[PDB]
RNA sequence: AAAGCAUUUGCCAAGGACGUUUUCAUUAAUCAAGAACGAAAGUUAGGGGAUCGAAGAUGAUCAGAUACCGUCGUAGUCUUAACCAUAAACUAUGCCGACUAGGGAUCGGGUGGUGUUUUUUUAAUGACCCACUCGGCACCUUACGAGAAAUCAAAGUCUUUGGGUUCU
C-alpha cells in the first residue's frame, strides 16, 4: 500500500482475482482429453461444455451441462491437454 | 318453576376398538316423550377428547379427536372417528423466527368412500454445524418438498380405511415416512400431520360399525 | 365469620397515588406454604400477624 | 431535518409493505414500522401454579403457554410505555435490553 | 379413576366474563353464570374479583348435579378484536380449583382468523 | 421501470445475475416532439346485503359540538368493461461512465477443499463449514474529502472551478 509492484503481482493475488480483472484478461478454463468405457478413441472436451457430448461411436454421454463446469459422467479418464 | 335438571339420564359414551381406553365419560340427554325421543337428540352429538387420554400415554397430549356418536343401545352410546386435530399449544409453540414453514394438504377418500382433507405441517431446520442464524429453504425446495409430502399423504389413503387410517396416525408411522423421503432435499425438522377433515359420508352400513364395537 | 389470620414474611413496598397503602407478603400462620401478597392501610413492621376478612384477592399495586 | 435514517422503520428496498392494525387502537401502519413485541404467557399465573397442582388429574403433565404477536401503532407504544423515547446519540443503538 | 368430566367454557372479554360448563359434548350445558350478574355497576362486570364469584355459584351447583372434574377451554373476544384474554379468566379458573372441582387438559381456544375481515376505528383508529 | 407484488397446482409468454477459449462488430449514452404503464379516489349500465366514518340516523360529552367517543347505516379498495392520469407518486437525492477506505453480515450464480453430515462403506447429489469471486438490498467505523450545518463512501475527486447528457 502506497508502493506496489503493479506489474509483477505475486501468482498468488493474481490467482484470487476475477478472470477479467487480472493485469492481462484471460479463460481460467481448459480442454479435456477423455477416454469413455466404450472405445478407445481420442476425444476433445470443453471443461464448461453446454452440450451434451458424446463419442463419434456408440454415442453414450460423456459429461452434463451444468451452470459452471461440465460434469463429467460415470467414470471416464481424463487428461488436461 | 320447573327444575329441568332431574328429568334427564345419563349415557356412557364408547370409544371404538382402534383406541385402548374405550370409557370417554358421560352425557345428559332428556326422556324420551311422545313423538320426542331420546336417540334422535343423541345421534348427532361430536365429542372432542384428547387422544392421550384414549392411549393413556402423554406422548399424545397435543392432539384431539373429533368422536361422532352414530348409534345408542343398552344406555350406552357408541362413536366414530370424525377428524382428528392438533391442538393450539403445540401448533404455536413450533412456529418460530428464522426458518420456513412448509405446508401441503390433499383432499383423497379412502378404499371406503370416506372422503378426507389431510393436513401436513413441515419445518426446516438449523444442521449441526451451522454458523448462519436463520436456515431458510429455497423455493424450489420448498414446492419439491410439497410434491413429495402430497405423493405420500395420497398413496397411504388408497390403501386403507379409517378402520387402519387411525391404526397408523397414532404411531407416527406417516411422519417418519416423510422424513426419509425428504431428508435428502432438505434436513426438515418437526414433521407432523396436524389435521384430517371428513368431507363426505356413504350410507350408514350399521355392520360396519358394529364390527368396530363389540368388545370389552 | 370465617376469619383467618397471616403474618407479614416480607414488605415489599408502598402503594397508591398519595402512597398510603403498603403492599406486604405474608404467611397464613394455620398452613405456612400458603403465601399470598395483599396491601395494607396503616404503619406495619416485619413479623407481625394480619386478620384476613377473606384470603382470595391476591391484590395488585394501586394507583 | 432529517431524524432517522430509516425514515422510521425498514423499508429499504421495496416501495411497498402491506400494513397492519394496532392492537389498542387499530390505527393502519405499514408492516415493517408497527413495532412488534411477542408475548409468551402461562395460561395460569404465578400466583395459581401452585393452586392448580393439587387440583389437577393428571399429575404434573404440562402447563400450555398463550403465543401472542402484538403490533403497535407509534402512538400507543409511547403511550403504553414499551418504547420511551431517548437521546440523539441513544437512539441509534438497534439492540434488545 | 371414577371422575367424571364436565367442560368449563370460559370467556373473558374486557367488558365482562362468562362461566360457562356443559358436559363433554358442548349440548346440556349445566350452569352458565357470568361476572355481571355478581355486581350490578355496569363496569365491574369484567372485574376478577365479579369473575370469581361467577365461579363460587358454578362448582355449586356442578356439585349438586354431580359433576365432580372439568377440562376447561379459555378464550378471549378473538376475530378481529383483542386475541389477549381479560383480567377475569386468571381469577375464574384458580375459583375453580378452590371450590373442589378437579381441573385436567387446559388449553386456549381464541378465535384467530387466517387474515380475514376489516378492523375497527377505519385507519386511523379509536383515537384518543 | 415505477405504481406494486406473500399458503397451493397446472398452463402462457417474460426477466436480472452468473458461467462461456460462442456469435455480430460500434450496432452506444442521454433525450424536444411523440408514446406505454400507473396507489387511490367519484364520470359511467348485473351481482352480492357492513365491519368504518361522511353525512345521515342517533346516544353521550360540552358554554356550544354541526367533532373526537358509542350503535346503525347509503354512495364509496369485489364485476367483464377507461381515469385526461394525480400522491410526502420520497431515498424529498435524474441517467450513463471512471477513480478514491477499512470491515463484518446476508440474497443469487460460480470456483476450490487428501472438509462435516445424510446412507450402501464411503459414494452421487442435497444441507452445512472454510476460502475466493461476480452481481444485488443494506449496514458498521472513520473523515483524506465535502457541507451552512444536520449529516454524506457520495451529498467526495469543486475558485487547483471542464467525463457525457436531459429537466428544473
Ligand atoms: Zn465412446
Same mark, same amino acid.
Given at each position: 500500500?502506497?508502493?506496489?509492484?503493479?506489474?509483477?503481482?505475486?501468482?498468488?493475488?493474481?490467482?484470487?482475482?476475477?478472470?477479467?480483472?487480472?493485469?492481462?484478461?484471460?479463460?481460467?478454463?481448459?480442454?479435456?482429453?477423455?477416454?469413455?468405457?466404450?472405445?478407445?478413441?481420442?476425444?476433445?472436451?470443453?471443461?464448461?461444455?453446454?452440450?451434451?457430448?458424446?463419442?463419434?461411436?456408440?454415442?453414450?454421454?460423456?459429461?452434463?451441462?451444468?451452470?459452471?463446469?461440465?460434469?463429467?459422467?460415470?467414470?471416464?479418464?481424463?487428461?488436461?491437454? | 318453576?320447573?327444575?329441568?335438571?332431574?328429568?334427564?339420564?345419563?349415557?356412557?359414551?364408547?370409544?371404538?376398538?382402534?383406541?385402548?381406553?374405550?370409557?370417554?365419560?358421560?352425557?345428559?340427554?332428556?326422556?324420551?316423550?311422545?313423538?320426542?325421543?331420546?336417540?334422535?337428540?343423541?345421534?348427532?352429538?361430536?365429542?372432542?377428547?384428547?387422544?392421550?387420554?384414549?392411549?393413556?400415554?402423554?406422548?399424545?397430549? %397435543?392432539?384431539?379427536?373429533?368422536?361422532?356418536?352414530?348409534?345408542?343401545?343398552?344406555?350406552?352410546?357408541?362413536?366414530?372417528?370424525?377428524?382428528?386435530?392438533?391442538?393450539?399449544?403445540?401448533?404455536?409453540?413450533?412456529?418460530?423466527?428464522?426458518?420456513?414453514?412448509?405446508?401441503?394438504?390433499?383432499?383423497?377418500?379412502?378404499?371406503?368412500?370416506?372422503?378426507?382433507?389431510?393436513?401436513?405441517?413441515?419445518?426446516?431446520?438449523?444442521?449441526?454445524?451451522?454458523?448462519?442464524?436463520?436456515?431458510?429453504?429455497?423455493?424450489?425446495?420448498?414446492?419439491?418438498?410439497?410434491?413429495?409430502?402430497?405423493?405420500?399423504?395420497?398413496?397411504?389413503?388408497?390403501?386403507?380405511?379409517?378402520?387402519?387410517?387411525?391404526?397408523?396416525?397414532?404411531?407416527?408411522?406417516?411422519?417418519?415416512?416423510?422424513?426419509?423421503?425428504?431428508?435428502?432435499?432438505?434436513?426438515?425438522?418437526?414433521?407432523?400431520?396436524?389435521?384430517?377433515?371428513?368431507?363426505?359420508?356413504?350410507? %350408514?352400513?350399521?355392520?360396519?360399525?358394529?364390527?368396530?364395537?363389540?368388545?370389552? | 365469620?370465617?376469619?383467618?389470620?397471616?403474618?407479614?414474611?416480607?414488605?415489599?413496598?408502598?402503594?397508591?397515588?398519595?402512597?398510603?397503602?403498603?403492599?406486604?407478603?405474608?404467611?397464613? &400462620?394455620?398452613?405456612?406454604?400458603?403465601?399470598?401478597?395483599?396491601?395494607?392501610?396503616?404503619?406495619?413492621?416485619?413479623?407481625?400477624?394480619?386478620?384476613?376478612?377473606?384470603?382470595?384477592?391476591?391484590?395488585?399495586? &394501586?394507583? | 431535518?432529517?431524524?432517522?435514517?430509516?425514515?422510521?422503520?425498514?423499508?429499504?428496498?421495496?416501495?411497498?409493505?402491506?400494513?397492519?392494525?394496532?392492537?389498542?387502537?387499530?390505527?393502519?401502519?405499514?408492516?415493517?414500522?408497527?413495532?412488534?413485541?411477542?408475548?409468551?404467557?402461562?395460561?395460569?399465573?404465578?400466583?395459581?401454579?401452585?393452586?392448580?397442582?393439587?387440583?389437577?388429574?393428571?399429575?404434573?403433565?404440562?402447563?400450555?403457554?398463550?403465543?401472542?404477536?402484538?403490533?403497535?401503532?407509534?402512538?400507543?407504544?409511547?403511550?403504553?410505555?414499551?418504547?420511551?423515547?431517548?437521546?440523539?446519540?441513544?437512539?441509534?443503538?438497534?439492540?434488545?435490553? | 379413576?371414577?371422575?367424571?368430566?364436565?367442560?368449563?367454557?370460559?370467556?373473558?372479554?374486557?367488558?365482562?366474563?362468562?362461566?360457562?360448563?356443559?358436559?363433554?359434548?358442548?349440548?346440556?350445558?349445566?350452569?352458565?353464570?357470568?361476572?355481571?350478574?355478581?355486581?350490578?355497576?355496569?363496569?365491574?362486570?369484567?372485574?376478577?374479583?365479579?369473575?370469581?364469584?361467577?365461579?363460587?355459584?358454578?362448582?355449586?351447583?356442578?356439585?349438586?348435579?354431580?359433576?365432580?372434574?372439568?377440562?376447561?377451554?379459555?378464550?378471549?373476544?378473538?376475530?378481529?378484536?383483542?386475541?389477549?384474554?381479560?383480567?377475569?379468566?386468571?381469577?375464574?379458573?384458580?375459583?375453580?380449583?378452590?371450590?373442589?372441582?378437579?381441573?385436567?387438559?387446559?388449553?386456549?381456544?381464541?378465535?384467530?382468523?387466517?387474515?380475514?375481515?376489516?378492523?375497527?376505528?377505519?385507519?386511523?383508529?379509536?383515537?384518543?
Amino acid at each position: 500500500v502506497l508502493v506496489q509492484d503493479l506489474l509483477h503481482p505475486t501468482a498468488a493475488s493474481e490467482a484470487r482475482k476475477h478472470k477479467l480483472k487480472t493485469l492481462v484478461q484471460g479463460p481460467r478454463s481448459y480442454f479435456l482429453d477423455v477416454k469413455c468405457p466404450g472405445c478407445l478413441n481420442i476425444t476433445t472436451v470443453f471443461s464448461h461444455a453446454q452440450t451434451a457430448v458424446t463419442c463419434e461411436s456408440c454415442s453414450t454421454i460423456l459429461c452434463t451441462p451444468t451452470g459452471g463446469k461440465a460434469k463429467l459422467s460415470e467414470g471416464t479418464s481424463f487428461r488436461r491437454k | 318453576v320447573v327444575d329441568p335438571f332431574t328429568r334427564k339420564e345419563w349415557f356412557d359414551i364408547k370409544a371404538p376398538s382402534t383406541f385402548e381406553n374405550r370409557n370417554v365419560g358421560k352425557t345428559l340427554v332428556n326422556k324420551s316423550t311422545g313423538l320426542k325421543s331420546a336417540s334422535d337428540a343423541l345421534k348427532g352429538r361430536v365429542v372432542e377428547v384428547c387422544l392421550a387420554d384414549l392411549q393413556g400415554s402423554e406422548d399424545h397430549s %397435543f392432539r384431539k379427536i373429533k368422536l361422532r356418536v352414530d348409534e345408542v343401545q343398552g344406555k350406552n352410546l357408541l362413536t366414530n372417528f370424525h377428524g382428528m386435530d392438533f391442538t393450539t399449544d403445540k401448533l404455536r409453540s413450533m412456529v418460530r423466527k428464522w426458518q420456513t414453514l412448509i405446508e401441503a394438504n390433499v383432499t383423497v377418500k379412502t378404499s371406503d368412500d370416506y372422503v378426507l382433507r389431510i393436513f401436513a405441517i413441515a419445518f426446516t431446520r438449523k444442521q449441526a454445524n451451522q454458523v448462519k442464524r436463520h436456515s431458510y429453504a429455497q423455493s424450489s425446495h420448498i414446492r419439491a418438498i410439497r410434491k413429495v409430502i402430497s405423493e405420500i399423504l395420497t398413496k397411504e389413503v388408497q390403501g386403507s380405511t379409517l378402520a387402519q387410517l387411525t391404526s397408523k396416525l397414532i404411531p407416527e408411522v406417516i411422519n417418519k415416512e416423510i422424513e426419509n423421503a425428504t431428508k435428502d432435499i432438505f434436513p426438515l425438522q418437526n414433521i407432523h400431520v396436524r389435521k384430517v377433515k371428513l368431507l363426505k359420508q356413504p350410507k %350408514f352400513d350399521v355392520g360396519a360399525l358394529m364390527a368396530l364395537h363389540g368388545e370389552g | 365469620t370465617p376469619v383467618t389470620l397471616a403474618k407479614v414474611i416480607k414488605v415489599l413496598g408502598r402503594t397508591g397515588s398519595r402512597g398510603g397503602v403498603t403492599q406486604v407478603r405474608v404467611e397464613f &400462620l394455620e398452613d405456612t406454604s400458603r403465601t399470598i401478597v395483599r396491601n395494607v392501610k396503616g404503619p406495619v413492621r416485619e413479623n407481625d400477624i394480619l386478620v384476613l376478612m377473606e384470603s382470595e384477592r391476591e391484590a395488585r399495586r &394501586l394507583r | 431535518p432529517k431524524k432517522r435514517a430509516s425514515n422510521g422503520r425498514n423499508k429499504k428496498g421495496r416501495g411497498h409493505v402491506k400494513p397492519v392494525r394496532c392492537v389498542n387502537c387499530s390505527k393502519s401502519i405499514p408492516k415493517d414500522k408497527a413495532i412488534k413485541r411477542m408475548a409468551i404467557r402461562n395460561i395460569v399465573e404465578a400466583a395459581a401454579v401452585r393452586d392448580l397442582s393439587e387440583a389437577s388429574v393428571y399429575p404434573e403433565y404440562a402447563l400450555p403457554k398463550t403465543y401472542n404477536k402484538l403490533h403497535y401503532c407509534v402512538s400507543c407504544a409511547i403511550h403504553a410505555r414499551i418504547v420511551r423515547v431517548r437521546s440523539r446519540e441513544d437512539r441509534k443503538n438497534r439492540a434488545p435490553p | 379413576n371414577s371422575q367424571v368430566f364436565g367442560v368449563a367454557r370460559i370467556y373473558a372479554s374486557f367488558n365482562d366474563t362468562f362461566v360457562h360448563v356443559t358436559d363433554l359434548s358442548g349440548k346440556e350445558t349445566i350452569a352458565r353464570v357470568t361476572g355481571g350478574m355478581k355486581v350490578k355497576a355496569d363496569r365491574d362486570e369484567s372485574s376478577p374479583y365479579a369473575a370469581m364469584l361467577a365461579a363460587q355459584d358454578v362448582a355449586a351447583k356442578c356439585k349438586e348435579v354431580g359433576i365432580t372434574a372439568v377440562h376447561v377451554k379459555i378464550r378471549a373476544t378473538g376475530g378481529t378484536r383483542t386475541k389477549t384474554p381479560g383480567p377475569g379468566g386468571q381469577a375464574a379458573l384458580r375459583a375453580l380449583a378452590r371450590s373442589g372441582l378437579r381441573i385436567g387438559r387446559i388449553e386456549d381456544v381464541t378465535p384467530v382468523p387466517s387474515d380475514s375481515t376489516r378492523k375497527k376505528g377505519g385507519r386511523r383508529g379509536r383515537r384518543l
